[PDB]
């Protein structure tokens, strides 16, 4: 009676890695795919200053994303209770010879 319940991915592929960075006091970093369902992202605060081509010495906002693709997946499905099926075999002696084993 097998109804699929939930599937897990155990091997994946990554593609289209990109990052967007912001100087301090210029707000939050932004990528157009950061709100995409198929993309995985992470925001962080990096050190920025004159070495990085920025006017002030402070914590800059950095977001990076990439597209996630599942390569191989496993599936957990439902066992409907009260929906089993046993199979039994019965064999009778006397007339039979062991070719019937």
């Amino acid at each position: 009676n097998m109804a699929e319940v939930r599937s897990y991915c155990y091997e994946a592929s990554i593609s289209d890695m990109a990052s967007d960075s912001r100087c301090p006091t210029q707000g939050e970093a932004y990528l157009d795919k950061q709100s995409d369902t198929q993309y995985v992202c992470k925001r962080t605060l990096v050190d920025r200053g004159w070495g990085n081509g920025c006017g002030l010495f402070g914590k800059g906002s950095l977001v990076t994303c990439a597209k996630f693709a599942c390569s191989k997946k496993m599936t957990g499905k439902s066992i409907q209770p009260e929906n089993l099926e046993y199979r039994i075999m019965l064999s009778v002696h006397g007339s039979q010879h062991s070719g019937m084993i």
């Epitope: 990109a18 967007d20 707000g27 939050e28 970093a29 932004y30 990528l31 157009d32 795919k33 709100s35 995409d36 369902t37 198929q38 993309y39």
Partner: antibody, heavy 120, light 115 residues
Framework: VQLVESGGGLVQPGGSLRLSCAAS????????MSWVRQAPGKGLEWVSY????????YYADSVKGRFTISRDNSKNTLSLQMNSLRGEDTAVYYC??????????????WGQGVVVTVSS | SVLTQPPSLSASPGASARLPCTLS?????????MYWYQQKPGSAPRLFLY?????????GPGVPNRVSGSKETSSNTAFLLISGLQPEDEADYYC?????????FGGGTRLTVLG
């Protein structure tokens, strides 16, 4: 999908106008909306955005502090309050669906716009 | 953030139209959602094409298959493509990007189908 604007006309510098747009053909309360202006003979420039629920509003630097965008999701109406109007604000004002989708945005549908003329 | 388009372009019917939109080094074209809007004289703009890549795109309602998009990272440019040009395709076209509450429009290209 129907976007019908109204509430425009001739205003004088330092006055105020209040634009209204009735929306139909879609679930209005589930989409963000934006106003876009186009001066006579020139290109397009975004004015202001408001989210579906109204919690978040954004304004262009040329309009900040002077304009205010509003929603009435029960009446399916988008409002744009314009204060301290100057001669730069003379343009056609378009009402547009500013949607949010999985990894996708955009001005899907536009109204035909209303004329706003600021002159002394 | 500046979007740069040529003021005007022209071609004959049956042509493969190619309309550029230069992104300033502020952003990078490869990571941008591209929204093209078509506006014919006397009418409002309509959403013509959404384009992130050849695998992430959508044509506007009633926009034929001949309309396509592309990018080139070397020149930080986006392109609007119209195969087999037709008189009805003569219009004004604007590229547009989103950037953290900022909606930036290009100058706009006025496409002219020659007749």
């Amino acid at each position: 999908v129907q976007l019908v604007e109204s509430g425009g006309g001739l205003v004088q510098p330092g006055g105020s106008l209040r634009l209204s747009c009735a929306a139909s053909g879609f679930t209005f309360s589930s989409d963000g909306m934006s106003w876009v202006r186009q001066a006579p003979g020139k290109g397009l420039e975004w004015v202001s955005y408001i989210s579906s629920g109204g919690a978040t509003t954004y304004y262009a630097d040329s309009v900040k502090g002077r304009f205010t965008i509003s929603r009435d999701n029960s009446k399916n109406t988008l409002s744009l309050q314009m204060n301290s109007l100057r001669g730069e604000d003379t343009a056609v004002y378009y009402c547009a669906k500013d949607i949010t989708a999985p990894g996708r945005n955009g001005l899907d549908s536009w109204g035909q716009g209303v004329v706003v003329t600021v002159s002394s | 953030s500046v979007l740069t388009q040529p003021p005007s372009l022209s071609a004959s019917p049956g042509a493969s139209a190619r309309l550029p939109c230069t992104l300033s080094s502020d952003l990078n074209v490869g990571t941008k959602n591209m929204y093209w809007y078509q506006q014919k004289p006397g009418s409002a703009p309509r959403l013509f094409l959404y384009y992130y890549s050849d695998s992430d795109k959508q044509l506007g309602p009633g926009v034929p298959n001949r309309v396509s998009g592309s990018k080139e990272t070397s020149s930080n440019t986006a392109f609007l493509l119209i195969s087999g040009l037709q008189p009805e395709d003569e219009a004004d076209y604007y590229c547009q990007v989103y950037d953290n509450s900022a909606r930036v429009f290009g100058g706009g290209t006025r496409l002219t189908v020659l007749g």
